[PDB]
């Protein structure tokens, strides 16, 4: 019931502590969320002492964060469409 970063923190708590860069991800999400939002890799790396390709691992971990989890719960989605005109055009120029 908060920002996905808080949801990301909850998922990381649920996730095993053996995950690499978990502390770095937590530090980034704590008060460096703006740096991640603007994709300012230079300033973010300078502030957080981010290592080369470590940001790639953190991004990969954030990929498996289940953003918008409630969307998956609402698996049901009835289809809505109206027939209106038809453009089947069988054999070309068909009077659909």
């Amino acid at each position: 019931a908060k920002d996905l970063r808080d949801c990301l923190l909850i998922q990381l708590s649920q996730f095993a502590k053996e995950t690499p860069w978990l502390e770095e991800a937590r530090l980034i999400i704590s008060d460096h969320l703006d740096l991640l939002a603007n994709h300012d890799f230079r300033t973010l790396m300078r502030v957080t002492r981010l290592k080369e390709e470590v940001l790639k691992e953190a991004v990969n971990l954030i990929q498996s964060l289940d953003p918008r989890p409630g969307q998956s719960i609402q698996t049901s989605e009835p289809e809505y469409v109206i027939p209106d005109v038809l453009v089947r055009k069988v054999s070309g120029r068909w009077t659909v």
Binding site: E79, Y80, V81, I82
Partner: protein, 49 residues
């Protein structure tokens, strides 16, 4: 069907009215084993979205 060695014998009440005793040999020999086919289908259903 298969031709099974059968005997007419009460066995400790395992054949009270219509109950039948089977061998571990027959199941080990993979006799009578049955194979079935289940099916699934799925559509797309283009919507206004």
């Amino acid at each position: 069907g298969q031709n099974m060695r059968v005997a007419f014998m009460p066995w400790n009440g395992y054949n009270f009215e219509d109950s039948i005793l089977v061998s571990e040999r027959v199941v080990q020999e993979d006799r009578f084993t049955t194979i079935h086919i289940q099916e699934l289908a799925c559509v797309s259903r283009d919507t206004k979205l």
